Copies of this chain bind each other. A is one copy, B any other.
């Protein structure tokens, strides 16, 4: 029992982190097979970041300008290319610690673990979600760019995020490993505002199921609702509309607990309308939305 914000074990990703330096800019890179992946803004000076022409800046760079260090060992760069907003540095040595991996582009509401790194050295691991506005709420200082986000299925790491940027509101923007930003963000030091940070309704419901499974039940009530009725409430409280697809995904948690999805929606509706009245759920005083239904089943079943 107990339910915690839990990250994937990070060792498989730790084995892939390197330092990349171009001129006097240092950030992190991801070494899989004989390619190192890093944000293309490694080629920029702070001056360049105002309005960079990355194709033009990259012409002035050679293989020998990209200093790639894996712990204390230098890697030999034998090619480089730009793919969207990432550079791919071909090195002469396959990473011997390369795990089974995939590159995935995640949808808003999906969760992933971040291995925050500085100078190719892991500092910490925490759990994130791709927000509906395509930001993430991370913990990233200067030098953390190129840190990645991932999920693990048994022995296969699915990399879904590489860190590129901070918005003035303190939320985070990155790319997938094809270098395509999540959302409308660009790797330029310009006016970029996040849209509405809407709450991931299907995740809140999953977490309420987690709460019941782990003994927190005070918020269960005598009510039910409908998807359309619930969605009137979701709209008012800047929650994502609940769809039958979301109901279908919560089916296993419904089955395990014997609480119909729409009955849990009626509990959530009352929590939205009445607040928590100074009470807590799984140690939280607000409605937690960064556990997916898959996360809840995993943590409640002990998958490795």
Contact = CB atoms under 8 A, between A and B. Distances in A.
Contacts of A117: 304
A2 B138 contact: yes
Contacts of A144: 302
Nearest to A278: B275
A54 to B, nearest CB: 25
A126 B5 contact: yes
Contacts of A280: 286
Nearest to A172: B2
Given A126-B7, A284-B285, A143 B2 contact: no
B4 A302 contact: no
A252 interface: no
Interface residues of A, number: 53
A214 B138 CA distance: 12
A255 interface: no
Nearest to A7: B125
Contact of A7 (B124, B140, B141): B124
Q: How many copies does the complex hold?
A: 2
Interface in A276-304: 276, 278, 280, 283-286, 298-304
Interface in A81-121: 115-119, 121
Interface in A258-279: 275-276, 278
Nearest to A97: B11
A8 interface: yes
Contact of A126 (B6, B138, B284, B300): B6
A118 B304 contact: yes
A11 B7 contact: no
A275 B285 CA distance: 11
A170 interface: yes
A6 B137 contact: no
Contacts of A283: 137
Contacts of A10: 9-11, 125
A166 interface: yes
A254 interface: no
Given A1-B170, A286-B285, A9 B122 contact: yes
Nearest to A138: B2
B122 A304 contact: yes
Contacts of A214: 170
A11 B8 contact: no
A236 to B, nearest CB: 16
A199 B166 CA distance: 33
A23 interface: no
A301 B139 CA distance: 11
Contact of A5 (B5, B15, B285, B299): B5
11 contacts: A2-B140, A2-B170, A3-B139, A5-B5, A9-B11, A9-B125, A123-B303, A139-B299, A141-B300, A141-B301, A285-B286
